[PDB]
């Protein structure tokens, strides 16, 4: 009944530490993969070309590309 | 002076999503200058009538990142 695809993706710092402190609870991106609601995203905090060896793992609880431009999704976030 | 207080419409579907915490996010035109700390009040509609319920959220993070012309998105804290 549920097999969540797990995404991982490069965030840089500034987002990251929104994220990780719960200020920042969406994420914008291009629906490249094909994002469904229960898929997990290993964010990866990158900074200036380098990954910094630092991650947090969230749930894409919800989903819309309501305003976007075209192929953009924001991605509500639940981080674990 | 104090944070800014929105009042502002939203569609059933979508109340329902903000109220059970599964939408954290509000997308709006920002001609309210909106800032982090304002308090938006989010008021029920659906197909123009006024359906008698609203929530409280606290604006905690803004952005326009990849957004249209004037778009932001907001972060929203459910009270
Ligand atoms: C600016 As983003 C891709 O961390 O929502
Ligand atoms: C769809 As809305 C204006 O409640 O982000």
């Given at each position: 009944?549920?097999?969540?695809?797990?995404?991982?993706?490069?965030?840089?710092?500034?987002?990251?530490?929104?994220?990780?402190?719960?200020?920042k609870?969406?994420?914008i991106?291009?629906?490249?993969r094909?994002?469904?609601?229960?898929?997990?995203?290993?964010?990866?905090?990158?900074?200036?070309?380098?990954?910094?060896?630092?991650?947090?793992?969230?749930?894409?609880?919800?989903?819309?590309?309501?305003?976007?431009?075209?192929?953009?999704?924001?991605?509500?976030?639940?981080?674990?």
């Open positions: 009944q549920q097999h969540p695809t797990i995404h991982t993706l490069k965030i840089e710092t500034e987002f990251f530490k929104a994220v990780k402190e719960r200020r609870t969406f994420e991106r291009k629906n490249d094909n994002f469904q609601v229960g898929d997990i995203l290993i964010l990866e905090e990158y900074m200036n070309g380098m990954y910094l060896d630092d991650e947090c793992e969230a749930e894409v609880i919800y989903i819309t590309d309501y305003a976007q431009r075209e192929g953009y999704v924001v991605l509500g976030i639940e981080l674990h």
